[PDB]
Amino acid sequence: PYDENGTPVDIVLNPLGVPSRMNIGQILETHLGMAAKGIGDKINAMLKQQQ
Amino acid sequence: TVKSDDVNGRTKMYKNIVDGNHQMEPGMPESFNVLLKEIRSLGINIELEDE
Amino acid sequence: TEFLKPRLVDIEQVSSTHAKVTLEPLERGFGHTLGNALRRILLSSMPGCAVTEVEIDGVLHEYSTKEGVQEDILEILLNLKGLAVRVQGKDEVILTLNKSGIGPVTAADITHDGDVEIVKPQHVICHLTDENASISMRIKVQRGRGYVPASTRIHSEEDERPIGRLLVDACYSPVERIAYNVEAARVEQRTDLDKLVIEMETNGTIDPEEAIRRAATILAEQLEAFVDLRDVRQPEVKEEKPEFDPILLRPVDDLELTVRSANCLKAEAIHYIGDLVQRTEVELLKTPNLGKKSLTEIKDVLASRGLSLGMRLENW
Amino acid sequence: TEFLKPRLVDIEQVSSTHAKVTLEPLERGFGHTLGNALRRILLSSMPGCAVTEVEIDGVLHEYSTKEGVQEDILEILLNLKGLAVRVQGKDEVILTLNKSGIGPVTAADITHDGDVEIVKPQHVICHLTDENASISMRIKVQRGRGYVPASTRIHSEEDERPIGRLLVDACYSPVERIAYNVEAARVEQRTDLDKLVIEMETNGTIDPEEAIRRAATILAEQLEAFVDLRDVRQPEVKEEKPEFDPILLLPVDDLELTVRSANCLKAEAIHYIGDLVQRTEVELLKTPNLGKKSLTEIKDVLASRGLSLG
Amino acid sequence: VQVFTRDGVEKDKRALEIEEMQLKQAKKDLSEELQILEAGLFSRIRAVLVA
Amino acid sequence: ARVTVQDAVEKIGNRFDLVLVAARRARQMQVGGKDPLVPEENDKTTVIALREIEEGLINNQILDVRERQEQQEQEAAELQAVTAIAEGRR
Amino acid sequence: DMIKGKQGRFRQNLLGKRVDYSGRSVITVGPYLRLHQCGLPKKMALELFKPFIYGKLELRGLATTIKAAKKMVEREEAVVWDILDEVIREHPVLLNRAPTLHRLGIQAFEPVLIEGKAIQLHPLVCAAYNADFDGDQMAVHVPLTLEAQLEARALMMSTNNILSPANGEPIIVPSQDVVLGLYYMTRDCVNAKGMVLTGPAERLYRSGLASLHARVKVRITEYEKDANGELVAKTSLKDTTVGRAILWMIVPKGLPYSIVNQALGKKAISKMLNTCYRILGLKPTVIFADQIMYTGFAYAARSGASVGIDDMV
Amino acid sequence: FTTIHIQELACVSRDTKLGPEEITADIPNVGEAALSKLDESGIVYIGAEVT
């Protein structure tokens, strides 16, 4: 699959299993990691043009 | 037998591709031959009949 | 027939090893996926430059060190192997490191007054400790192709390389890093299509605004692949040997011919003239030292027997 | 180089709607690139022709009824968005569909209000039940080669549309599967190399044996991003593949042919002149399609490069 | 790679070359260490003089 | 047929006597090449053994009809002297 | 201690024992394997089939001797692979998911060659085995007698043992996320990109306005096989979807369309196969179970079903 | 997600009536390419690849 960034996704893991696992920290690390790594990807672009 | 302790069985069955007639040719489960003398080494007599 | 092949578009140079061409307008989604194709080519299979082979002034293997340096050779060579450059005649140059005397050892201690652009004139290798101490080597360098480490042939790679002739990590590929990004179309006719953005960064062997076609060819020359529909293939041609009458059951001894011919036809393994009677003349140009004169002897020494060249048969 | 001008040699038809479709030889696994990058092209901006808007003698709204039909009216919304065709010309054409008396409603009940071919006879629409029954409609059709939603056409969506003019999206292409696998090439000696496989399937209108040979070269519209983005063609080669006349290995194309006759012949795996020598006028037909000018008289110019039959 | 034995047998050629592989490291490093050491110690004496 | 196989059970009504009949064809191919009456379609000897009851004919159970009667129509020819042989037991 | 407790010959060397022509590795999902098949790495196929190679080179001349052949067999050289199609093309591999408390923990298949070091496992039997993908394993056994191969196809084959021995629902069955795909194809929505709408053609997911939740309606004439073998023909208006209509390609059309006019979760889907087993025949019921697998994989992803912070109202 | 490992393998020469035992490369016509990589003492070189 690919994002609303127009860019593919390195890994895919089944959420239909998750309600039997009874745990949600795995979703919250995934969403907070999207902020945490997204900071670094935006830095890779910004370091070029600098502005 | 032909995939285990029966040395006769496994050594023929391996080569029964060269016969073309890939068949069983067993001889004696050696783990039962062993047991027929372990039982006699405890002191219990054990032997066979025909049909 | 309604091709589009678009051209001309954009420029944003940043620093020699990175520039930033971008593409708009694009049709309804093209920019969202296409940047994943070159993610193979600009890693695996590219030409560019690398070191191919090395020979050193007292170091038979890189797994070691030399009594006078201040740094140690395996984990030095891991950094030396990245020295990749550009070359302007034939593909190869056997460069030299020429170094002696106290201090650092660098890309400025290397032979560079010829067909070569050492774009890495700030690379550093190690130190030396006295005004008469040395470190020196021959260094084969090509433009080459691929991402080849120092063991890739994997057998016939025990090979007999004279003890100190190092095979090297010939990683010719001038990029591993390539990726892309996207916008909406912003060409001031529109706000209603898509837009591709490139983030290529390199081995320093080139810049992203310097050259490209061979680096996109395993995507451009993948198009003739669907049309113009004639193709390519090779045969089997021989028979299983051999019986009477003993006109064919004879080695080259029977021919009355010269000695260099009898050495190279021996290497070419033609120990029965029963097949020299039928092998094509162009198919004798298949082992060296077998040239314009020995290839010309064949043309009557076979006939001298009362025989001929060019006599294929349905049973041998 | 091993981008060995890798023509579509091995197609294998399955009957006038589906072929195997394969591309060879490829760079140590490169069917993994082509089978996912080019397969997205084959789903983006493609040809064919189909229904786009409709005007019917009862469907002034979808909650309506027609005592004599069997769909009543609402189960007519089944094969419109469903009927497809080809078209010679410009991107708007028209049909009508005019069934009277008992029956289905079918191609045999159409009338041609414009330039429209109909490679979909089997696309039955609805039914009627009495000796005095009738139904009639107009149909709008378009070809283009790209997609937009029926209610996000946005500028050309504010025209005068009567209380009965039904509205559809850019339906212009009738394909029903496209697959994907990767295994070894045929290329009988150059064998470190793979093939892409794609197993496409339709509804008739095109076999994947037609819908390839310019339908894939839409790649000529995906390359501005990569192969001279600007104005700077540089000295570097194409480095080729030759194998010469009249070698017994040469393709059937080296008899000089007549449109996609070349594709549908080599699809029988008779890709090469060497075995075509067996095909005497007693058992010749085993091939797909290959129906006319090709089949007629080429058998005497076959004997001018120099082959024969008997 | 290693070779070992009862000690009265001094060690085999493939270990005796590896002796000079390990000795190289210490033979070099101690020739750096002696300089690194006195470049501190005599720099303290040098500083007491500079005062 | 390799492509799914339980239909050869429902073809008969039982499942292991099935394997005895299959083996009765199988050994006569693998140790005798005995004549077929249908092709293989690449169902190699393991499943040519099952083909014999996907149809129901080509083990020796119909050679017991065919080749065993080619003898007995000589016994019919020759019956004119088989009387003298059967009389000549007394 | 050769007899009385656990370690004795009876349990350690007789009623179970160590066995040749065998192996184990980590389970992996194999969604392109057809129901009669299993995937096996080339060098594991080489190891498991050495008696066919060191046993046929000397029977075709494809090596000068079994001694010299060390250079060719361990190499996986070309001549190995005629020697192995001569097996693979009709050979039932046995597979195992110990501890085998129930029959379906052991079944029989057919090789497919692959990369890697794993064992590749057909998705419908992953349910019948209870396969647990945390780096747990399965085991492999090659049958080599003509008789063991005959009975493996007749008695142990997946296609030939589909049902629960306790009652008779399928356990060789449309499995873990396959059935969300089938449920998704058979759910319907308001607005729906098609609140009522129809079409054929997968390529119309690329025409601009379609959904598998779009609410099709169609008269479909539909049939039902009697116990005597005749067909009770029927016809009905329907209230349905594009995914419910595509399933009339896959459904064995001697049972009626109206059975699909629901939502095919694990609650329901087994009973379609069960009804096929009660009425049509074995091959029709196998094809209806097998072809539903890839039908699930074409559409399970396109459901976009997730777990996330606003999936938690 | 390529991982890197370091693992160990060993051998012996027993106390014979003389004292030593043999260690060399002679395994003629059994797998010759799997021999090409060795010391005089029948041992691989530090830095060589093996598989």
Spatial CA neighbour of C198 closest among C183, C213, C185: C183
CA separation for the pair G225, G233 (Å, rounded): 9
A22-51: burial string, b at 16+ Cβ within 10 Å, e else: eeeeebeeeeeeeeeeeeeeeeeeeeeeee
The distance from CA G136 to its chain's CA centroid, rounded to whole angstroms, is 19
CA separation for the pair D225, G225 (Å, rounded): 59
Spatial CA neighbour of G270 closest among G249, G254, G285, G248: G285
CA separation for the pair G142, G152 (Å, rounded): 10
CA separation for the pair F32, F51 (Å, rounded): 17
The boundaries of the domain holding residue F4 are: 1-79
Q: Which two tokens stand for residue G23?
A: 């192996």
The β-bridge relationship of strands G111-114 and G38-41 is parallel
Q: Chain C interface, mutation test: which of E18, E24, E25, most C Cβ atoms within 10 Å?
A: E24
Contact flag for E and D (3+ C-beta pairs < 8 Å): no
Answer whether residue F8 is part of any domain.
yes
From residue G52, alpha-carbon distances to B18, B22, C187, G49 in Å are 9, 10, 67, 5
In terms of CA atoms, which chain D residue is nearest residue G218?
D75
Spatial CA neighbour of D266 closest among D8, D25, D44: D8
- G208-D63-G222 Cα angle (round to 5): 75
G188 is in an annotated binding site: no
The β-bridge relationship of strands G119-121 and G22-29 is parallel
Answer whether residue F46 is part of any domain.
yes
C-alpha dihedral sign at G75, G81, G86, G88: positive
Secondary structure of chain F: what % helix, strand, coil (to 5)?
55, 0, 45
In terms of CA atoms, which chain C residue is nearest residue H36?
C158
Phi, psi torsion values for D139, nearest 5 degrees: -140, 130
CA separation for the pair D217, D230 (Å, rounded): 21
From residue D215, alpha-carbon distances to C201, D219, D271, G137 in Å are 34, 9, 22, 46
CA separation for the pair G145, B25 (Å, rounded): 9
CB neighbours (10 Å) of residue G305? 16
Type of residue found at C212: I
Answer whether residue F73 is part of any domain.
yes
Contact residues, chain B to chain F, C-beta under 8 Å:
20-22
Count Cβ atoms within 10 A of the Cβ of residue C134 and give its class: 0-12 exposed, 13-18 middle, 19 or more buried: middle
Q: Chain E interface, mutation test: which of C59, C61, C62, C65, most E Cβ atoms within 10 Å?
A: C65
Cβ within 8 Å of residue H34, ≥6 positions away:
none
CA separation for the pair C44, C275 (Å, rounded): 43
Type of residue found at H29: N
CA separation for the pair G25, G118 (Å, rounded): 5
Matching residue, tokens 């029988």: D268
3-state secondary structure at position G190? coil
Q: Chain E interface, mutation test: which of H6, H37, H41, most E Cβ atoms within 10 Å?
A: H41
CA separation for the pair A6, D7 (Å, rounded): 31
- Interface contact C70-E32, CB threshold 8 A: yes
Spatial CA neighbour of D198 closest among D6, D17, D13, D23: D23
Stretch (H or E) spanning C65: none
3-state secondary structure at position C83? coil
Q: Which two tokens stand for residue F31?
A: 């140790």
Cβ within 8 Å of residue G168, ≥6 positions away:
G274, G277
CA separation for the pair C55, C247 (Å, rounded): 54
Tell me D134's DSSP state.
B
Answer whether residue F3 is part of any domain.
yes
CA separation for the pair D16, D145 (Å, rounded): 22
Answer whether residue F84 is part of any domain.
no
Count Cβ atoms within 10 A of the Cβ of residue D310 and give its class: 0-12 exposed, 13-18 middle, 19 or more buried: exposed
CATH of residue F25: 3.90.940.10
3-state secondary structure at position F75? helix
CB neighbours (10 Å) of residue D301? 11
- Interface contact G208-D176, CB threshold 8 A: no
| Chain F environment of B21 (Cβ under 8 Å) | 27, 30-31
Q: What is the experimental resolution, given in Å to one decimal place?
A: 17.0
- Interface contact G202-D62, CB threshold 8 A: no
Answer whether residue F23 is part of any domain.
yes
From residue F11, alpha-carbon distances to C200, D100, F79, G147 in Å are 66, 51, 41, 20
The β-bridge relationship of strands G38-41 and G137-141 is unpaired
G82 is in an annotated binding site: no
Type of residue found at D84: A
Spatial CA neighbour of D153 closest among D166, D171, D169: D169
Q: Does C183 touch chain E (CB under 8 A)?
A: no
CA separation for the pair C77, C82 (Å, rounded): 9
Phi-psi map region of D22: left, alpha, beta (phi>0 left; psi -120 to 50 alpha): beta
Phi, psi torsion values for D235, nearest 5 degrees: -70, 100
Beta bridge pairs of residue D194: D26, D184
| Chain A environment of C20 (Cβ under 8 Å) | 48-49
Q: Does E24 touch chain C (CB under 8 A)?
A: yes
What is the count of structural domains for chain F? 1
CA separation for the pair D169, C191 (Å, rounded): 22
Q: Which two tokens stand for residue H40?
A: 């005089």
Answer whether residue F86 is part of any domain.
no
| Chain E environment of H25 (Cβ under 8 Å) | none
Beta bridge pairs of residue D142: D50
Spatial CA neighbour of F52 closest among F16, F85, F23: F23
CA separation for the pair G38, G158 (Å, rounded): 11
Nearest C-alpha of chain G: how many angstroms from D170? 5
In terms of CA atoms, which chain E residue is nearest residue H8?
E1
F40-72: burial string, b at 16+ Cβ within 10 Å, e else: eeebbbbbbbbbbbeeeebbeeeeeeeeeeeee
CB neighbours (10 Å) of residue H48? 14
Count the residues in chain D. Answer: 310
CA separation for the pair C168, C148 (Å, rounded): 9
| Chain G environment of A15 (Cβ under 8 Å) | 305-308
Matching residue, tokens 């180089």: D1
From residue F62, alpha-carbon distances to D230, F11, F25, F30, G117 in Å are 80, 19, 11, 19, 49
Phi, psi torsion values for C55, nearest 5 degrees: -140, 130
CA separation for the pair C115, C90 (Å, rounded): 9
- Interface contact A24-G301, CB threshold 8 A: no
Tell me F36's DSSP state.
P
Tell me G155's DSSP state.
I
